[PDB]
Design an enzyme around this catalytic site. Structure first.
Site, short mmCIF file in Angstrom:
data_model
loop_
_atom_site.label_atom_id
_atom_site.label_comp_id
_atom_site.label_asym_id
_atom_site.label_seq_id
_atom_site.Cartn_x
_atom_site.Cartn_y
_atom_site.Cartn_z
N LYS A 118 58.79 148.43 17.73
CA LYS A 118 59.74 149.09 16.85
C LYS A 118 59.88 148.28 15.57
O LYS A 118 60.46 147.18 15.60
CB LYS A 118 61.10 149.24 17.54
CG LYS A 118 62.21 149.82 16.65
CD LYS A 118 63.13 148.71 16.19
CE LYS A 118 63.84 149.03 14.89
NZ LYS A 118 65.10 148.26 14.76
N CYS A 135 63.84 133.11 7.61
CA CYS A 135 64.73 132.53 8.61
C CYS A 135 64.78 131.01 8.54
O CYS A 135 65.78 130.40 8.94
CB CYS A 135 64.30 132.99 10.00
SG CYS A 135 62.56 132.70 10.37
#
Lengths: 507, 507
Positions: free
Chosen positions: B189, B302
């Site tokens: 996804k 990140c």
């Protein structure tokens, strides 16, 4: 034989204290709230001692003790930590009879299992991981002529561990040895049913560890265990036990983004293909033995082979070999080496299994052996002893689906390899399985076709170090009893080092 | 210099379709409910195409395909799966310009990042993991003369993977390459913010995989992602994204007792010791680059070094070299190779960062550079551009503690090493870190002193394969971009085989 005298009687090898405390910061101390529970021997129901009903305030004393020593302990050299685990192992060997008699009285299992399996395997687990820490290496690879990645194993710090009752000291070793070898400090919560053994062990080995490295808090799973599982001061949680509490443990770990290893329950299928009846007569016995081995530790084993799957063609002839050995099980005094099946661990486990015998009967399970209580004479009368039970049914029954955790085996037949595979994997568990056949190709296929963490081939209930033990499906996550354990109690620090003194053109 | 034309314009390297479906079972299919969301370019706010707003019925169809192909795919030989990933990598290189422009248009980042980092690194990941599967070995150890332990790597089967928007294709490779190499079928996804890249990748590389091996379900995180994250039909979930959603993945994974790996967020400290001012002039400049590198990918990383820690003694002299580069940042068309800092990924990201700048000013955070919008001319005005911001404050501020995920660096000073390490570890994250010093011993101490999974030493923002990438603390669980991941996408099957016949004397 040898019939050990009951603990605390003339000729007994050990006499337990009337009251034990927690072990925190290198000392035995009372609980903060001064609350105690009474423990009883499942061998006869007679009192043993009291142990702290510790509350969250006791976890935090141990967490204070563990954290203070964390920096120095994780810094202790590989050689020194290893040597310490070697010293613990020797201490375990030297007190083999004392430890086994304590375990048997606390847990109820036959003494011959504690002497020949639990305690020797416990010593070896310390030997094994002391050995593996001397060999462990991080990695160093060149990305190019001026860029080198380094990977250095680092301890996690303070870890919480909760162990069950069916192997109190050996389950302790399964967790204490790798976490200690990895340089972590441990807060250990023993089963409220079996707190005695760990205390006696700590009295024997405490001085070998720096203060605050090993802290053991006694109490209940929904008190001490809850306070421990949700502690924001542990870097990892580790749990062995029943699936519903494990599922919760993983949730407790999820909230704080900490590693977790959980080893849960199983419904192990024991598979006997038709060719075994064509092997030597001695092999036939080992296979029939391998089925009766389901009564090892009174069936209180997470990999208990509680589902016997026998090929139709050999079922009539094979069970006749199995039943000869089932009837040969000597019952009686657990401190008697000759006794082959001891007491169930608790009154709750004893009652839970008795309700499962009744449930088997309503589903048409045909009783082939046992099926009720075993009323032993003497002081044994107040103990928790059940008959070895062999039941015949089909996999769709409740007794073939749910873990009983007792000396109860379901027997059903299968037609061909494909159905044998279908019945073996038609469970939500996947911890262990047995497979008995001499066709080298059948052994391999079924070995890889079954969805279980361990497939014993032409044997059962071997739990050596240096073999990974862990679950598929709802049986758990992570492996034990193997050097891969070390990666669960450490994190990899990557040093990516550039030795070029000029910029990369992005500036 | 070279200015790639906007997609669908004269001379453009790519023209996107007006409407795209999901990819299931080897085909591009519409969603079951035929519902679409519109995707827009962050470079200019202009629409791109329509994409499926898939629901749980689309998640389950792809899971039906994955399971159908799971047995045949997992059985394909190591040699064959490896070769397939090598062909995928080549396909990516052969279309380097086309895909990188797709990334830039979909994500907004500068093309020179997609050309020089993201796209080649994605290709290497497939080359890298094709290689590591050729080298993977299980274990074979003799426990004794007639007892042999075998450990066999086995694929997990069907796995769900959900990737974020800040490296759409590169995060795809970070997850697709090891899971496919391990023999799993994937339901993937992608972030609804960046759905385009996967489709273009699939149009180029889909044919190389058997139908149902690679399935991509487009949609929203709470709809399709929820249905997948809670699926009972995956043996493992894998997720990269924001920390609060990570814990939830770990909760949903806890619900079904499946292994889990999570990359989460970070607030990476970049530490500059005083001795760097005594190195060669080229080292000094590389160091100033390493701070400005925080604006790489618009700070949407990140491990973005959004916390710069500079020793007090050198702060005035170092910051002027750092400020020399901050002012020199070229801005303009993301498809302009000369453009060094592109657009933020979305409108929510653009406004979320602006809300943190507003907060930064009200907390006494001193503005040294940027601090507002980047008002670009032409059609870029409808894009989402913010100025590179250097702020001076102290570690205790909110902007120094919470992830902004934008072109924002907090700068602070320290007196000595002990204070440098203490400020470095005063974060809830532990994903990445930087370390700049020439003292070999200082480099090692801080290197092991910092509690981050990666410590870049005298470099930054190198993400090569063959270097473990993963988080400490609330930054995540598990490692990526290294061969040790394979054990996350495989399960260990222990075959414990006894070659001794006859019984062992028990029972």
């Amino acid at each position: 034989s040898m019939i050990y005298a009951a603990p605390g009687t003339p000729g007994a090898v050990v006499t337990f204290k009337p009251r034990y405390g927690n072990y925190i910061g290198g000392e035995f101390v009372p609980p903060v709230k001064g609350q105690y529970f009474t423990n009883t021997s499942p061998v006869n129901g007679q009192p043993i001692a009291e142990f702290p009903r510790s509350t969250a305030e006791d976890i935090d004393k141990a967490l204070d003790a563990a954290h203070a020593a964390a920096e120095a302990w994780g810094r202790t050299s590989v050689q020194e930590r290893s040597n310490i685990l070697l010293k613990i192992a020797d201490r375990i060997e030297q007190n083999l009879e004392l430890l086994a008699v304590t375990e048997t009285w606390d847990n109820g299992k036959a003494v011959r299992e504690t002497l020949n399996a639990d305690i020797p395997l416990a010593a070896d687990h310390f030997r094994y991981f002391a050995g593996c820490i001397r060999a462990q290496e991080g990695s160093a690879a060149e990305i190019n002529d001026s860029t080198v990645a380094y990977h250095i194993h680092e301890p996690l710090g303070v870890v919480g561990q909760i162990i069950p009752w069916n192997f109190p000291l050996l389950m302790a070793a399964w967790k204490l040895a790798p976490a200690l070898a990895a340089g972590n400090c441990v807060v250990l919560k023993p089963a409220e049913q079996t707190p005695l053994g760990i205390c006696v062990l700590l009295e024997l080995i405490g001085d070998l560890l720096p203060p605050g490295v090993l802290n053991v808090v006694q109490g209940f799973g929904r008190e001490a265990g809850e306070a421990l599982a949700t502690s924001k001061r542990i870097a990892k949680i580790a749990f062995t036990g029943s699936t519903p509490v494990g599922s919760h443990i993983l949730k407790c770990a999820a909230e704080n983004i900490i590693p977790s290893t959980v080893e849960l329950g199983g419904k192990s299928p024991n598979i006997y293909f038709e060719d075994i009846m064509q092997a030597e007569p001695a092999f036939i016995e080992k296979a029939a033995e391998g089925l009766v081995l389901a009564f090892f530790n009174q069936g209180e084993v997470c990999t208990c082979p509680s589902r016997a799957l026998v090929q139709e063609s050999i079922y009539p002839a094979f069970m006749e070999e199995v039943l000869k050995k089932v009837r040969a099980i000597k019952r009686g005094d657990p401190l008697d080496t000759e006794t082959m099946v001891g007491a169930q661990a608790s009154q709750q486990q004893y009652e839970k299994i008795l309700s499962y015998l009744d449930i088997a009967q309503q589903e048409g399970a045909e009783l082939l052996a046992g099926g009720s209580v075993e009323k032993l004479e003497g002081n044994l009368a107040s103990g928790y002893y059940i008959q070895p039970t062999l039941l015949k049914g089909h996999n769709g029954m409740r007794v073939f689906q749910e873990e009983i955790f007792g000396p109860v085996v379901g027997v059903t037949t299968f037609k061909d390899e494909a159905e044998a595979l279908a019945i073996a994997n038609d469970t939500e568990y996947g911890l262990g399985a047995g497979l008995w056949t001499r066709d080298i190709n059948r052994a391999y296929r079924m070995g890889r076709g079954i969805k279980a963490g361990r497939v014993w081939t032409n044997c059962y209930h071997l739990y050596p170090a240096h073999a990974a033990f862990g679950g598929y499906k709802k049986s758990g996550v992570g492996r034990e009893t193997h050097k891969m354990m070390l990666d669960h109690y450490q994190q990899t620090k990557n040093l990516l080092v550039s030795y070029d003194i000029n910029p990369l053109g992005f500036f």
